[PDB]
């Protein structure tokens, strides 16, 4: 992005509108596949993941 | 203060669980321990 | 405090002993039986909770002191509406790579919309723009058009903090209303007396 | 005779833990991932129901005259979309139910051969006595013999 | 540096005590302490 | 597919015009796509 | 050979407790939820009708 009224451009946030799809996308969501691969027992797709 | 924060319990519980597997290969056992021979009995 | 009519088939550690009695104690006066002492409703909720037993005592403290132990990703309690949808296709049993990818490009392909949402209105919940909360609604770009809620919180900041915690944003919500009917793209939300 | 018994022990055993391996057929996976994915497909068709009677507001008639359109259309089209939610839903639970039968059913398999198998361990100890008995009769013999 | 636990998570090991002893925050020693 | 495509054309003459019901086609496509999940569903039956 | 008989029955009687315990697996109870919580939901749809 770049900052309103024009600025520096910058990074993507974790904080404030939309930490918490960012949270699920760059962690949870990671994780849950590789959790439930490992339940089932396919510990090497969960190894990927 | 007497009281110190311990080792939290899974991670002894991980090398416990990988120790017993290295005893039990250090002794040709099953990974349950058990003895693989059939441990034949006579006099 | 102690009973005096076990057998003496039973065996104990003198510690033990005196937690049961002290165990005892507490759940009496807890009970309100003996004179005067009374006790909070939060102290005793905790008591009837948890610190009536070792157990769950130790549970607490454990989960105070490591919480990273109790984290589990399918307990999450902050969690998104399609998120629901992706865990309920992985959940469906035996699986395959393949198959997760195609649930993940699905979730994927919803968060695309999220991320074209557009807001539309708001509506404050009172005078105090610095403390009081706001509501919002947006609809997507893409049609059909659909619509969603969502509030802030202008409470939780930190005392320190020219800032907010992140918990300060809601979650965007659905609306199920037929709203289709709309006459001209326009909507107004309003929040009273809590509903 | 203890032979005998030592064979059918032992393909009783071997035949269980068979069934151990394997656990899933091919099929079956298939079964699974045939009901998962039709399930999740239905969701799709929702948007579509929306969108169509979300069109069909707009008038029909020109002219002379005007005819609007059927104005209950879209609330119509979102009863149908509860319903169609609801068919979704209970066609998932099926599959779930299938996989945790076959897991039932592994268990089981599991359990049955272990057992098998301590009965085809017991067997040797029969026949370890038997050749001891077998060295007293001839000790009896011997005994007579002399 | 390299990748290990306690390089990931460096900390004195001296820092905590063994568990089950007396000495752990939350013996039931500590509880009947938080209880009396 | 072929019956909502037909009814796409007007309905009707004279000093009036009609159309047609412009959803038809989307609804029949949602209604396509819940017989193909009853098809699938039906075959995983006779697998079993 | 008695230390043998004791083995199996020692298993075969704590296997089956195992399934005596934890009697309803979370999936199970995820069955019936969604079902029971389906049903409940198609309520709604007649008043929409």
């Not at chain 4, 269980?16 to 091919?26: A, G, Q």
């Not at chain 4, 969108?51 to 209950?72: C, F, K, Q, R, T």
Request: glycine share 4%; charged share 25%.
């Amino acid at each position: 992005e770049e900052a309103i009224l024009g600025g520096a451009a910058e990074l993507i946030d974790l904080d404030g509108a939309n930490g918490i799809y960012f949270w699920e996308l760059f962690f949870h969501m990671p994780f849950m596949v590789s959790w439930r691969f490992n339940v089932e027992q396919r510990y090497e797709d969960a190894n990927r993941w | 203060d007497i009281f110190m924060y311990p080792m939290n319990n899974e991670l002894r519980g991980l090398w416990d669980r990988i120790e017993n597997r290295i005893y039990n290969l250090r002794h040709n056992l099953t990974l349950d321990g058990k003895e693989i021979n059939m441990d034949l009995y006579d006099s | 405090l102690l009973d005096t009519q076990v057998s003496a088939k039973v065996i104990t550690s003198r510690l033990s002993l005196v937690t049961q009695s002290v165990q005892q104690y507490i759940n009496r006066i807890a009970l309100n039986l003996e004179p005067g002492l009374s006790i909070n409703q939060q102290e005793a909720t905790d008591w009837e909770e948890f610190a009536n037993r070792y157990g769950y005592w130790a549970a607490n403290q454990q989960l105070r002191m490591f919480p990273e132990i109790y984290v589990d990703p399918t307990l999450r309690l902050t969690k998104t509406e399609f998120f629901f949808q992706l865990e309920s296709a992985l959940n469906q049993g035996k699986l395959t790579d393949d198959v997760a990818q195609k649930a993940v490009l699905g979730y994927l392909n919803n968060f695309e919309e999220v991320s074209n949402l557009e807001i539309i209105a708001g509506y404050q919940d009172g005078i105090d723009i610095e403390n009081d909360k706001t509501y919002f609604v947006a609809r997507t770009r893409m049609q059909p058009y659909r619509y969603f809620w969502r509030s802030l919180d202008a409470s939780q900041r930190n005392a320190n903090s020219q800032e907010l915690y992140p918990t300060a944003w809601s979650e965007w919500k659905a609306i199920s209303v037929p709203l289709e009917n709309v006459a001209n793209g326009i909507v107004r939300p309003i929040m009273m007396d809590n509903r | 005779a203890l032979q005998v018994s030592k064979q059918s022990a032992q393909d009783r055993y071997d035949h269980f833990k068979e069934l151990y391996d394997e656990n899933i057929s091919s099929t079956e996976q298939k079964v699974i991932e045939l009901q998962s994915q039709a399930a999740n497909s239905l969701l799709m068709a929702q948007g579509m129901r929306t969108a169509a009677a979300a069109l069909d507001v707009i008038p029909n008639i020109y002219g002379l005259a005007v005819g609007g359109s059927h104005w209950g259309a879209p609330l119509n089209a979102a009863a149908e979309i509860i319903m169609i939610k609801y068919q979704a839903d209970s066609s998932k639970s099926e599959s779930l139910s299938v996989s945790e039968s076959y897991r039932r059913r592994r268990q089981e398999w599991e359990l049955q051969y272990k057992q098998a198998e301590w009965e085809v361990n017991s067997v040797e100890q029969q026949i370890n006595l038997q050749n001891m008995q077998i060295k007293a009769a001839n000790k009896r013999l011997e005994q007579v013999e002399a | 540096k390299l990748p290990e636990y306690n390089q990931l998570f460096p900390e004195p090991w001296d820092n905590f005590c063994r568990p089950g002893a007396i000495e752990a925050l939350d013996s039931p020693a500590s509880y009947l302490l938080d209880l009396y």
